[PDB]
Amino acid sequence: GLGPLQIWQTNFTLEPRMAPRSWLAVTVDTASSAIVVTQHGRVTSVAAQHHWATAIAVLGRPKAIKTDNGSCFTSKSTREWLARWGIAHTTGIPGNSQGQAMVERANRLLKDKIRVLAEGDGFMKRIPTSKQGELLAKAMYALNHF
Amino acid sequence: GLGPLQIWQTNFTLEPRMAPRSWLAVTVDTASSAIVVTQHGRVTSVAAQHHWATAIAVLGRPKAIKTDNGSCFTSKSTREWLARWGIAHTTGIPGNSQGQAMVERANRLLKDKIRVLAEGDGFMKRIPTSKQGELLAKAMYALNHF
């Protein structure tokens, strides 16, 4: 009667400083504006499902997820993973202001944090594989508990 | 003046259903009672640091962390990782009611959830490696957003 709606926007964005696992899956909760990000070697239905299993453990189960029409989000595999959870799914096309403007904003902020933090530690190009995880967790922490 | 203190308790517990990475690092936030758990192949200073980098991204930075005297928590490596973050560290001995009773309670709840969920999917012994992550995220979600 006063409190907000549980709707996420999700997308994949490429980040070569994080190679070989340079596909970041990013979820913005459109209410809290909280971000969740995970590292993936490839963008697959299962990469998306793994990301959302993580986001759900961090943020709770949402009412719906807004994605674009990427095939990893509209595959039979994902439709069923989402129905198994009872999460409504709405689509659109890349960057669609509707349900993709906030996540594109988040991609930018995130890639920015990654650059600043990495360069701060001396890494001007790729981040050493063993350093990536903490650097990624440090970026999410900064963006969220800002 | 009214709101609570940011103090975590952390430990490692063994769980062979999650092998080869059967060392779970579990953190209870003593205020919220929120749990964070990650999978590790070995219990090392760096396994602890990686866990806490994750917990911090999920729960925020705490004022202090209560552990036991395990060497992974009192090594030079960890002392410095914690000082780099500005997190106070207090120790004790395994299960120490003081700062280890709540986490031992959490180990139990967690291993229970894991068993029920795994057996629910047909896995009576070890969980298939590719299923472990979502099953682990599903356990944390259940225990937290209970």
CB-nearest to B57 from A50, A61, A140 is: A140
Quoted resolution (Å): 2.2
Judge contact between A58 and B144, C-beta under 8 A: no
d(CA A124, CA A102): 28
Q: Mutate which of B39, B117, B141 to disrupt the A interface (most A C-beta within 10 Å)?
A: B141
Task: Give the DSSP letter of residue A60.
Answer: -
DSSP structure string for chain B: --S---EEEEEEEE-GGGTTS-EEEEEEETTT--EEEEEESS--HHHHHHHHHHHHHHH---SEEE--S-HHHHSHHHHHHHHHHT-EEE---TT-HHHHHHHHHHHHHHHHHHHHHHHHTT-SSPPPHHHHHHHHHHHHHHHH--
The upper half-sphere exposure of residue B117, i.e. CA atoms within 13 Å in the direction of its Cβ, equals: 22
Two tokens at B121?
């999917």
What number of other Cβ atoms are within 10 A of residue B3's Cβ? 6
Question: Could you tell me the CA-to-CA distances from B44 to B12, B33, B51, B74, B94 in Å, in that order?
Answer: 10, 25, 11, 11, 17
3-state secondary structure A115-128: HHHHHHCCCCCCCC
- Across the interface, do A54 and B140 touch by the CB < 8 Å criterion? no
Chain B: closest CA distance from residue A19 (Å):
19
- Axis crossing angle, helix B45-59 with helix A129-144, rounded to the nearest 10: 20
What number of other Cβ atoms are within 10 A of residue A76's Cβ? 8
3-state class (DSSP) for residue A139:
helix
d(CA B61, CA B82): 11
Judge contact between A37 and A133, C-beta under 8 A: no
d(CA A95, CA A8): 14
Judge contact between B66 and B44, C-beta under 8 A: no
Judge contact between B81 and B102, C-beta under 8 A: no
Judge contact between B104 and B11, C-beta under 8 A: yes
Judge contact between B85 and B67, C-beta under 8 A: no
What number of other Cβ atoms are within 10 A of residue B74's Cβ? 15
* Class of the CATH-defined domain A1-146: alpha beta
Experimentally determined by: X-ray
Residues 6+ apart with CB under 8 A from B51: B10, B25, B27, B36, B38, B40
Q: Where are the domains of chain B?
A: 1-146
What number of other Cβ atoms are within 10 A of residue B137's Cβ? 19
CA A102 from centre of chain: 11
- Across the interface, do A133 and B56 touch by the CB < 8 Å criterion? no
What number of other Cβ atoms are within 10 A of residue B100's Cβ? 21
Angle at A86 between CA A82 and CA A92, to 5 degrees: 50
d(CA A144, CA A59): 12
Taking the Cβ of residue A61 and every Cβ of chain B, the question of whether any pair is shorter than 8 Å is answered with yes
Judge contact between B28 and B34, C-beta under 8 A: yes
Taking the Cβ of residue B75 and every Cβ of chain A, the question of whether any pair is shorter than 8 Å is answered with no
Q: Residue B64 phi/psi, 5° resolution? A: -155, 160
Residues 6+ apart with CB under 8 A from B97: none
Taking Cα atoms as reference points, which of A99, A139, A144 lies closest to residue A119? Answer: A139
Q: Which helix (H) or strand (E) holds A138?
A: helix A129-144
d(CA B19, CA B39): 9
Judge contact between A39 and B133, C-beta under 8 A: no
Taking Cα atoms as reference points, which of B56, B59, B48 lies closest to residue B25? Answer: B48
Taking the Cβ of residue B53 and every Cβ of chain A, the question of whether any pair is shorter than 8 Å is answered with yes
Angle at A86 between CA A40 and CA A10, to 5 degrees: 35
Q: Which long-range contacts (CB under 8 A, 24 or more apart) does A110-118 make?
A: A110/A13, A110/A24, A110/A26, A110/A35, A110/A37, A110/A139, A110/A140, A110/A143, A111/A13, A111/A15, A113/A139, A113/A142, A113/A143, A114/A15, A114/A17, A114/A18, A114/A139, A115/A17, A117/A142, A118/A17
Cα-Cα end-to-end distance for chain A: 28
Taking Cα atoms as reference points, which of B64, B73, B54 lies closest to residue B140? Answer: B54
Two tokens at A44?
């697959």
The CA R_g of chain B, rounded to the nearest whole Å, is 15
d(CA A105, CA A96): 12
